[PDB]
Amino acid sequence: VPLVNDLDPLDILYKLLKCADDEGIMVQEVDSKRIFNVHIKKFKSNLKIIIPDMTNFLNILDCAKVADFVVFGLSGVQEVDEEFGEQIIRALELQGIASYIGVISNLSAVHEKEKFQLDVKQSLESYFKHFFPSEERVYNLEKNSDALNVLRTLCQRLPRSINWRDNRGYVVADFVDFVETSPDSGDLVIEGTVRGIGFNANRLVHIPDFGDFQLNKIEKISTVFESNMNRDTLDEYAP
Amino acid sequence: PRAPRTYSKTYSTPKRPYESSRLDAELKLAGEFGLKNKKEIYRISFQLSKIRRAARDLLTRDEKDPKRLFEGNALIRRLVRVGVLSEDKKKLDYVLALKVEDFLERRLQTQVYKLGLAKSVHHARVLITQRHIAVGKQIVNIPSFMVRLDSEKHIDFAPTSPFGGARPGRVARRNAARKAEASGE
Amino acid sequence: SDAVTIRTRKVISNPLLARKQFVVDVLHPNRANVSKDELREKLAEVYKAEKDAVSVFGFRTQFGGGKSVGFGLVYNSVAEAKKFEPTYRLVRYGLAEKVEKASRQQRKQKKNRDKKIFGTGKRLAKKVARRNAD
Amino acid sequence: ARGPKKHLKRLAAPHHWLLDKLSGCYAPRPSAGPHKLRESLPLIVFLRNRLKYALNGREVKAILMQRHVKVDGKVRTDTTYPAGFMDVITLDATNENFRLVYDVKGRFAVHRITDEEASYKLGKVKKVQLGKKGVPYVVTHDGRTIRYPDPNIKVNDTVKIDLASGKITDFIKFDAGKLVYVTGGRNLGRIGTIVHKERHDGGFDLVHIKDSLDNTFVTRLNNVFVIGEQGKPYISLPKGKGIKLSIAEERDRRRAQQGL
RNA sequence: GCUACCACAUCCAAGGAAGGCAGCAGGCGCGCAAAUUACCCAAUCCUAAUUCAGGGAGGUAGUGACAAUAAAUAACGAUACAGGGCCCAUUCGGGUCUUGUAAUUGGAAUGAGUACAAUGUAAAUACCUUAACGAGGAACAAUUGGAGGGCAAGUCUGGUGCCAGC
RNA sequence: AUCUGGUUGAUCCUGCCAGUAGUCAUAUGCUUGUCUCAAAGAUUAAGCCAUGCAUGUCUAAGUAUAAGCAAUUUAUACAGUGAAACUGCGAAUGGCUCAUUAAAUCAGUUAUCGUUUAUUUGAUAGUUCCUUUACUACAUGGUAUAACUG
């Protein structure tokens, strides 16, 4: 999440991956892509890197609640704004969130003497004295040795996440294609990895801006399941 | 590793803490000379009680004994050179009756008030601390200098202080920048 | 106004590196700390030498202003002063240029992975260009 | 350990070199060479802690690589070559010639000598033996072997060595009433003359030595280096000339000399 | 450095193949109990075929109320009203004092802090030096423990015994 | 070179339990403005360990036909620089911990006429074709492999 409107999180990504000891991972993935799946061949882990669009606001509010680590970027040229930056910080912690990392991308703008680039960190501690008494560091990604234990922690840890979203099951899509069953109703194939506790053929599934739709079958591709006739009242006003 | 760096502790507290005939004579030295706490008075009894111990056993061994003559005539020579022993008391038995204010009267806080520079003993320790007094050419700012004897006569003000020299401080400059420009308006 | 007085004490004639070394002492009442550009250009005419053949270092200013003590020395050719003086003193004087390499951690990890290739490695290139081609 | 040791820590360095105990963590360790370890002095303690010519280690190697410094008419570049007793250190671009000899308080003294005394060197006699093919040799205290000597030389005598060709001019015997330097122990650096020498069979023999101010002392036999007959040494002695001054006598002799 | 068994534990296309932090930084363990995955070979010294390359040995900073040294948090006046006070004392006040206090009044000094420069240093950070800035200080505000006895310090008012072994 | 409270109605004793100071002696509680100097995963578990580093090295002077570069030029054997690899040397020093170990270690002290030793420093080698110069080179004998191409 960028916290000011003029930021390049793709460049913040390219400040997070220069210290990863491959080379040909950043240059081919530039054109128009907001989802990335990358395997880290040092700590032996795979990551699902997402980045939403700042022009919309509602998309920001759910891209947090799918995840467990939230990279909080800051700015070395301004402070935060109340109605849009500070409120969106107050937004996510009140609806519930897992852990996070506050971070700064660039510290070129303050003058190249050293002590002036020191205290500007201490100013940026301001929103982690009254917001959170649980995080005291801000990692300068221009430093190569601060940009590595931000890679150590997300590849090797996982925090206490939320209660309610965890205990029901939730899948993110990777490949969505439509196949035909009938002109009254067809079928969508959804490729993904199940998180939460799972998805079984005795209840329903809601997706926002589309709503509720009834499954038919479950296939795990390296267990072929179907939907029985024990459905509920698939209506609005149940008789 | 590396070599280790020596240090030492320089005072010592007393055995009985609350007994009243001690507590007053310490008080009347702290008001007479203006000392901050009683750690400053323990500092002068420690240094004394090793001088007294050092002469306390050269007296035991014989006279015309070449350790008495080399270590005696140096201890005597150092106490006169700062000016505690009297010049007619150059005998080894006379240091065994030395007292604690015979060092207290040689500090810079005490030797600048007697020499006519400050109107009180508390006008000394604030004159020294603020870099005003300069024996020789050197601004000192320690109220416990223990001035050597042949340099009692060099103390004066400093060639940088506003008292004995150049530009006034940033009140008078600020007051002149509050009135002289305000004379027109 | 300012008597910038320059003493030069404890002088030693050193022909084994072709120089003179001496303790520089400078009095400066009512000023803060005369800089190195002056103290290098001052001593040249006192010793009849080029500006580039002199160098100074290590200046501590006494407790309470007024003076500064330290060290300086001077060779009898500019050819010697590029030959003998350490190259971080030469880069102070605008005389030698800064080399630019990787940091100390990036050229340690770089040599630990050229410990795995017995040879030039060109024969290894056409191998993976064969198998990883398909 | 498993092999030889190769580092010398700073507090374990020999005391009369006077390295200050805060500058580093290790000291120079002397190489294997002519003189023993705790009885010698490398060329870096000479050229930067005594003559103050060099200010680093990197400056000493710059001096040694220009092939200036010789010992005994031979060039050395080993930055810890072990120069010891009675060695001659001939710089060239100053025309100075030095000789290593002892102080009185127990130190290695800076000593300048002429350009003619720097052509020879004494040395005592550690053993005399019959070598292979029946020729004899002689071993000095710095380790020079020299074949074909005179038969009248015995052990503990003193030879004179010509540094040019490595040969012998003449020699001095060892008996009562000779001039003697003392090169090890407590009375280290004092010069006196022989009273007599008693012998213990299967033990360490003791000499009795009288000073010039006629006060006597006793040392073992091996710390005794013959110099010449009485009143006439063969080398240029330092100031003080090996006279022990009591600490009482040298405060006031410093006091009255303090007139500058 | 390698090889065996013992205790361990890592990757695997299941055919196999690899491993020893009581070196330096850092781990999720334990317990009353102990710092940064930072910068460099400038010094100290060691090694090599060697002046040049290498060195978490070693140096420099960050974190550090483990211990030890030096010592800010106020100093000077005026009147005022008191007393004591030495004396002019006639008796006044004639002098010398000392305080006491008067949200009675005045002006001088200065570094904690900030910060052009220079100096420091391998490069920097800090300490020494120094332009401009920086106080009535009521706010630029010292704290821990006690006030029968041992053992310095209260005959003071308030609880229905709010908030009693002490 | 020092002592004070507590057994009885009252007093003298034996006698112990409080008190009182120190600690380069570790934790812990509340506070905390300045300069100099600085220990710091020992105790319990010599328990277990993700990732990166800590040991390599070339001079005029052992081996260069790089299909390297520089080209620059007196040089038809080669000669400037110089990757890879063979040969030589080092990796047995340093750094860390304190589990074992009670005549063992270790200290001050002897002995080697009882032994091995890279290196460094100083000496040291006409005799060795069957021969005293008779076949069979001393103006100089023989294969094998590395990097590299495929």
PDB file of C-alpha atoms (C1' of nucleotides) in Angstrom, chain E residues 97-154:
ATOM      1  C1'   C E  97      27.331  44.843  59.582  1.00  0.00           C
ATOM      2  C1'   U E  98      24.273  40.553  59.249  1.00  0.00           C
ATOM      3  C1'   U E  99      20.231  38.381  57.723  1.00  0.00           C
ATOM      4  C1'   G E 100      14.952  38.602  57.296  1.00  0.00           C
ATOM      5  C1'   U E 101      11.463  39.174  53.816  1.00  0.00           C
ATOM      6  C1'   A E 102       9.020  43.275  50.441  1.00  0.00           C
ATOM      7  C1'   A E 103       4.140  37.641  43.239  1.00  0.00           C
ATOM      8  C1'   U E 104       9.333  46.007  45.785  1.00  0.00           C
ATOM      9  C1'   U E 105      12.579  47.298  40.996  1.00  0.00           C
ATOM     10  C1'   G E 106      16.845  47.268  37.869  1.00  0.00           C
ATOM     11  C1'   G E 107      20.453  45.585  34.638  1.00  0.00           C
ATOM     12  C1'   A E 108      24.915  42.357  33.412  1.00  0.00           C
ATOM     13  C1'   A E 109      26.958  36.742  32.639  1.00  0.00           C
ATOM     14  C1'   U E 110      26.330  31.957  30.275  1.00  0.00           C
ATOM     15  C1'   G E 111      25.849  26.671  27.864  1.00  0.00           C
ATOM     16  C1'   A E 112      22.059  22.724  27.575  1.00  0.00           C
ATOM     17  C1'   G E 113      19.901  22.975  22.544  1.00  0.00           C
ATOM     18  C1'   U E 114      20.099  24.581  17.211  1.00  0.00           C
ATOM     19  C1'   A E 115      23.635  25.472  13.155  1.00  0.00           C
ATOM     20  C1'   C E 116      27.291  28.695   7.876  1.00  0.00           C
ATOM     21  C1'   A E 117      32.269  27.181   8.008  1.00  0.00           C
ATOM     22  C1'   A E 118      36.743  25.028   9.101  1.00  0.00           C
ATOM     23  C1'   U E 119      39.158  20.980  11.628  1.00  0.00           C
ATOM     24  C1'   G E 120      38.828  15.692  12.660  1.00  0.00           C
ATOM     25  C1'   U E 121      38.487  10.672   9.743  1.00  0.00           C
ATOM     26  C1'   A E 122      39.976   5.332   5.269  1.00  0.00           C
ATOM     27  C1'   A E 123      35.311   8.015   4.471  1.00  0.00           C
ATOM     28  C1'   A E 124      31.817   9.909   7.806  1.00  0.00           C
ATOM     29  C1'   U E 125      29.427  10.735  13.364  1.00  0.00           C
ATOM     30  C1'   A E 126      30.996  12.979  17.858  1.00  0.00           C
ATOM     31  C1'   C E 127      34.598  15.800  21.186  1.00  0.00           C
ATOM     32  C1'   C E 128      38.089  20.471  20.942  1.00  0.00           C
ATOM     33  C1'   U E 129      37.629  25.752  18.132  1.00  0.00           C
ATOM     34  C1'   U E 130      33.503  29.517  16.002  1.00  0.00           C
ATOM     35  C1'   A E 131      29.460  33.311  12.369  1.00  0.00           C
ATOM     36  C1'   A E 132      24.041  34.147  13.276  1.00  0.00           C
ATOM     37  C1'   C E 133      20.209  31.965  17.381  1.00  0.00           C
ATOM     38  C1'   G E 134      19.250  30.577  22.289  1.00  0.00           C
ATOM     39  C1'   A E 135      16.047  32.292  29.645  1.00  0.00           C
ATOM     40  C1'   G E 136      13.291  35.715  35.140  1.00  0.00           C
ATOM     41  C1'   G E 137      14.473  30.490  34.768  1.00  0.00           C
ATOM     42  C1'   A E 138       6.980  30.031  36.986  1.00  0.00           C
ATOM     43  C1'   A E 139       8.177  25.914  32.772  1.00  0.00           C
ATOM     44  C1'   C E 140      14.997  25.149  30.298  1.00  0.00           C
ATOM     45  C1'   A E 141      10.510  23.113  37.112  1.00  0.00           C
ATOM     46  C1'   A E 142      15.664  16.501  40.615  1.00  0.00           C
ATOM     47  C1'   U E 143      14.804  12.337  42.259  1.00  0.00           C
ATOM     48  C1'   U E 144      14.611   8.112  45.416  1.00  0.00           C
ATOM     49  C1'   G E 145      13.632   6.599  50.830  1.00  0.00           C
ATOM     50  C1'   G E 146      12.255   7.925  56.090  1.00  0.00           C
ATOM     51  C1'   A E 147      10.178  11.601  60.492  1.00  0.00           C
ATOM     52  C1'   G E 148       8.567   6.357  68.870  1.00  0.00           C
ATOM     53  C1'   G E 149      13.711   3.217  69.801  1.00  0.00           C
ATOM     54  C1'   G E 150      18.476   1.207  67.489  1.00  0.00           C
ATOM     55  C1'   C E 151      19.540   5.981  64.104  1.00  0.00           C
ATOM     56  C1'   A E 152      19.648  12.319  61.790  1.00  0.00           C
ATOM     57  C1'   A E 153      14.625  14.340  61.615  1.00  0.00           C
ATOM     58  C1'   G E 154       6.692  16.410  64.182  1.00  0.00           C
TER      59        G E 154
END
